[PDB]
Point group: D3
Chain length 236, copies 6
C-alpha cells in the first residue's frame, strides 16, 4: 500500500549511468539505481580460455565491506566467495554473453567486473544494466583496434527485480522492501522483448501463476525505461 | 520431435523412491529419476545456529567423481565447491525449508545431504523430490523422541525441469537433452499448487512469455505425478 | 568371547560384490562387507602425469556425510581432506598399483574413486577388495579399445582387518569392535600369498610378536575367501 | 628534470577529499590524489577482540580489478591476499591507531576499509590521509551516541611518498614515476611534525644518507599541505 | 651385499641426542640418526581440547625446504600439508601418547614439534626417538611446577626402520637405501618389548611372512641400542 | 639506561656464522645473533620464472613453532602465511637481489630459505646477514659448474635493527627490548655504505628527525662489524 521511498508500485528509482567512469578499462560505468551504486568495468584481454571454436566473456562481482548497512566480511580476507557472490557473478556472465555473438568477438576475452560501492537493493540488476553500457564502449575500443570480426553485439540487455511488498507487486526493490518481501523475482531481458533470465523465489506463501505473470508484466514494463536510459547514456 | 529416450514430451522418466536406504540417518532415501540416482539423507542435530526465534534446516550437495559421463574433479581434493554445487545446495535448502513450519520443529537442526551416485540430468530436481520423503521419515523419528513442538510439516514439495528440445517443451530433461537445450526451467512446487521456486535461463533465442507459460504448465502437470509417487512411497 | 554380530572370531561378514554398478565408469563396483557399502569406480583417462617411463593409477576416497553413525563434516565444504582420508587414499592407490604391471598399461591413467555410502567398519579393506574387481572390468574395456600394451594385471589383491576384541583376535572388524579394540591390523595381500601392506597399531597394551603373528595368520585365512568372492563376481 | 605530469618536483597532485561519500559507514571519504581515487570507510562495531585493557582499530585494503592499468586478479577469487595488500593494510592500521588514544575510544572496534577504485600511484598514502578524515567523522558519530570515554583523537595523521626520478627527489609519485624510480620512500607523519612511519627501498643504486634526508625533508614539506586539506574538508 | 655407508646390515647409524637444544620449550632435543637431524620440542600448554575425562598430547612435523637433496616446497606457502606430513605427524602423536598415562598428565596439553633440518632417511623414526627424550625433560618441568597428577610416564618409546636392500634386510635406512628398497618397515616399540606400531609396504615383490618376521627381529634388535642411547642422554 | 643483557647501547650481540651448515644446499649457513639462530640456505635451480631479460632470486621465511617463547602456530597447518612472514620474506628477497647483478647470474633461479630455530629478536636482520654468506658459497658452486655469466656479486649486504629503549637508541634489539620499545628501525646496507632498506615505525611518541638520524648513525656503525664478520666467515 505504501512503498518506503513513497515511490509508485510501477515506478523505477532514479537511474543514472556514467560512462568512462574510471580511466583504465576499455569500458567503465558507474550505474546508479537510487542508492544502489555499482562500478562496472570491462577489460579486453587477448586470447581465450580453452577454445578454438569465437571469443569469450566472464564476470566477477564484489562489494566494498561497508557498501552495506552492516559491514560485510571482505571475501579476500575470508579466503572464499560466498554463494550469493558466485550466484550473482554467474548471472552477470550469462546475461552479457547473451548480448553477444561470440563468434564475431574474435579470439579475445572480456572480463566484466562489477563492484558495489553502495548497496540498497538490486545490485545484480543494476550491475547487468550498467555493465551492458560498459560493454558497448569496450567493443568500440576493440573495433578501432581492428581486433573484432564484425559487430558481435546481438542486442542490448537490461535487468530488474520485482517483489510482493505488503501484498502488492512492486518494481525495482530497495533494501527495505527486499528484506520485507518473501516473494521476489529478478529478470533479465533483451530489446526484442525476450526473457534470457527469470528467477523467482517464495519464502512464505508460494506464489501462484497469476502472481508470477503479474510480476513478469510489471518487470517487462519498467524494462523499457531501462533500455531507454542505456541508449541515452550511449548518446553522450 | 523425437526425445532420445523415445519418451513423450509430457512424460516423466521412470521414478523410484526407496526409504530407509542407509541405516544411520533419521531419514534416508534413494531417489531415481531414470538414470539419475541420488542418496538423500536427513540428519537430526540438537540445537540451532545463531537463533532463539524455531528450528533450522540446511542442505549440502555432492557428486561422486564418476557419477558423470566424464569424471568430475572431487571438490574435497580441489579444496573448494564450485558455483553449480552451491547453487544447487541453496536451492535444496530453501525448498525444504518452505515445506516446514520451523517454529514447530523445536530447537533442532536438520542437515540434508544429497549425493549423486549416478547423474543423467535433473539431479537437483530429483534431490528435492527425494529429500522431502527423507524429511517426513525424519520428522516421525523426532516426533517419537518427543523433540518436536507440533507437526512442522506445512506441505509436501517436489521439483522438476522442462526444456526446449528441438523446439519443443519437454518434461524432465535427461543429460542429452539438457546439453542440447539452450532454454530450460527448473521448478519447485507444493501440493496446493503454488510455486516456491521458478528458474529459467535462455542461452540462445530468448524465450518469450508464451513459451515460459507453456513450460510452466508442463512442469505443473508432471508435478502432480511426483506428489503421487511420494505419497505412495510414504505408505510403505 | 562374544562378537556383537554373533559372528565367529574367524568368520567374515556377509560379502557382496556388484559389477557395472553405475553406468559411466569403465569399471564400477558396489562392494559390501556386511553393513559397510562402498561404490568403487575406475575412470580411464588418456595420457599420464609427469612420466615417459608405463601407465599410472591414482586413487581417492570419500564418505557421504551420513554414511557414519554421527554425521561427519563434508570435506568439500570444510575445504580440506582430513588425515584419515589421505591415509586411506594413499593405501588404496599403492594396493591397486601393486596389482599392475604399469608398463603394460600404456600411456593411460586410471582414476580409482572409492566412496562410502554406508560405513560400519573396514571401509578401506572393502574399498581395496572391491576396487580390484572394478579394475579388472576396466582393463577389459581398455583392451577392447586397443589402448593397452599387453595384460597389465600382475595379480589380484584383497584386503582385510583384524583386531583384539575382548582379548581375542577377530577377523573383519565392524564399527563397534573397531571402536572397542585398542589393537588392530589392516592387511593387503595378493593371490600368491604375499603381503603388500601390513599396518598394526596398539593404543593400549602394546602387542607382542606372538599376537601380531596370530593376527597375521587370521588375516591370511579370511583373505582366501575374498579372492574367491572376487573370482566369482568376475565370472558374471 | 621533467615530471610526466609536468608537475614541479615539490608539488603535490591536485587533492580532493569528499566526506559522507557513501551512506552506511559512520565515516566515509572519497580521497583523490590526482588520478588515484580511494573510498575510505570507518565502521563502528561494539566490543573488542581479545582485550580488557581500551578500544581497537584494524584496517583492510582492496583494489577493484581494473583500478589498475592492467587488470589485477581479484583476491576474493584467488582465495588469498598478496603481500602488497597485507603490507599496505598493516601500514594503514598502525598509522590510524597512532592517531588515537585507544583508552578513550571505549570498548568499541573501528574497521577501516580502503578500497581503490582507480590507481595511479600512492594509493597507500592517499588511503591514510583520507581514512583519517573518515575517522574524525566516525568519532563524532560515536560521541553523539555516548559510546566514547573522552576524545580519543590524539592527533591528525597524513602520508605521502617521495622518489628519485631521473635522479631527482620528487614529491607524491604517480604510477609512471613509481615504476621508473628505483629508490622511493613512503612516510606517515602527525601535526606536531613527528614521524610515525618511514619506509625507503633502493632497487638500484643504494641511497646515501644525504639523499634520504633530502627525501625526508621534501616529504615533510608537502605533508603540511595535506594537514591543511584535511582541516578544510572537516570544516564542511 | 654392500650398504652405501659401508655399514653392517645390523648396524645403526651413529646416533646423537642433545637435550635443551633450544631455550624456550619445556623440552627440546636435537636428535641425529647419521645425517638425519631433527629438532624435537615439547610445548606445555594449560588446558585441554574437548575433554573432561586426563591430559593430551598432539604432534606436528615439518621439514626445512632444503633439508632434502632436492628442495621441497614449503607447505606454509603451498597452503596445505601433504599426505606424508600428516602421516608422519599422526604416527608421532600416537607413539608418544602410548608412552603416557594421560590421566596422570593433568588437564594440560603437550604440543610436540618435530622439524627436520637435514634429511637422509628415517626422519620419522629419529623424530619419535628424539621427541621421547624431550618429553621426559618436559614432564620434569611440569612436575616442578606441580601441574601433574602423578608420574604420567608409562614407558619409553623408540622407533626404527628396516628395508630390503639388494635382497637383504638392513637396519635403519638412509636416503639412498630407502629410495632403492621396494619393501620397508617402520616400527615403534616400548622398553618392555611390545609393538605399538608396525607398518610395512611392498612396492615390488610382495614380502612373505618369513621376510616380515626377519625384518621385525632386526628392528627389535637395534631398538635396544636406542633405549640405551635415550637413557644415556637423560643421564646428562 | 640499562640493557637487559647488560650490553652497551652501541654493542652488537655475540655473532657467529657457520657455513656448510647442512649438506644439501649449494649454500647453507647457521647465523647467530646472540640467542637468535637461523638456518639460511640457498638452492640453485635451473631456469627462471617469467623472464628472458638475467637470473632470479626469491626468498622464504619460516619459524619453528617453539623457536619463540610462546609457541607460534605452524603456518603449514594454519594453511596461510601471516603478514609478518610475507613482510620479512619480501625484505630478504629484495635485500639479496640488491647484492646481485642478476644479468651475470645466468638463467638460473636462487631460492633463499631462512628458518628460525630459535628467536630472540632480530631474526630478519640475522637472516639477511647470514643468507648473504650462504649466497656467496652458492655462487662459487655455480661458478665451478660453469652456469654463470660472470661474477654476479655486486656487493655484500648486511642488516641490523635499532630501537629506543628506556629513551635511548640501542643497537641490535633482543626480544625483551623489541617488545618494550615503541620506536624501532630495521636497516639493510652495502659495503660502500649505501642504504638499500630503511624501515622505522613509532607506536607511541612519533620519532623526530634528530632521533631517526641518530638511530641511522648507530645502525651504520654496527653494520661495519657485520661486514667484517661475514668476510671472516668466508675466509674459512
Amino acid at each position: 500500500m505504501n512503498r518506503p521511498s513513497g515511490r509508485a508500485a510501477d515506478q523505477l528509482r532514479p537511474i543514472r549511468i556514467t560512462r568512462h567512469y574510471t580511466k583504465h578499462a576499455e569500458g567503465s560505468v558507474l550505474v546508479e539505481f537510487g542508492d544502489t551504486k555499482v562500478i562496472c568495468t570491462v577489460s579486453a584481454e587477448s586470447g581465450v580460455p580453452r577454445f578454438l571454436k569465437q571469443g569469450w566473456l566472464t564476470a566477477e562481482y564484489g562489494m566494498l565491506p561497508r557498501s552495506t548497512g552492516e559491514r560485510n566480511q571482505r571475501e579476500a580476507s575470508r579466503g572464499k566467495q560466498g554463494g550469493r557472490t558466485l550466484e550473482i557473478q554467474r548471472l552477470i556472465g550469462r546475461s552479457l554473453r547473451a548480448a553477444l555473438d561470440l563468434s564475431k568477438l574474435g579470439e579475445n576475452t572480456l572480463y566484466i567486473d562489477c563492484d558495489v560501492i553502495q548497496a540498497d537493493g538490486g545490485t545484480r540488476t543494476a550491475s547487468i544494466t550498467g555493465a551492458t553500457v560498459a560493454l558497448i564502449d569496450a567493443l568500440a575500443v576493440l573495433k578501432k583496434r581492428g581486433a573484432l570480426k564484425g559487430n558481435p553485439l546481438k542486442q542490448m540487455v537490461a535487468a530488474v527485480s520485482v517483489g510482493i511488498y505488503q501484498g502488492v507487486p512492486v518494481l525495482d526493490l530497495d533494501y527495505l522492501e527486499d528484506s520485507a518481501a518473501e516473494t521476489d523475482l529478478n529478470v533479465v531481458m533483451t530489446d526484442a522483448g525476450g526473457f534470457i533470465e527469470v528467477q523467482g523465489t517464495a519464502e512464505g506463501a508460494p506464489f501462484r501463476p497469476a502472481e508470477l505473470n503479474a510480476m513478469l508484466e510489471l518487470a517487462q514494463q519498467g524494462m523499457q525505461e531501462l533500455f531507454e536510459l542505456q541508449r541515452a547514456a550511449l548518446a553522450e
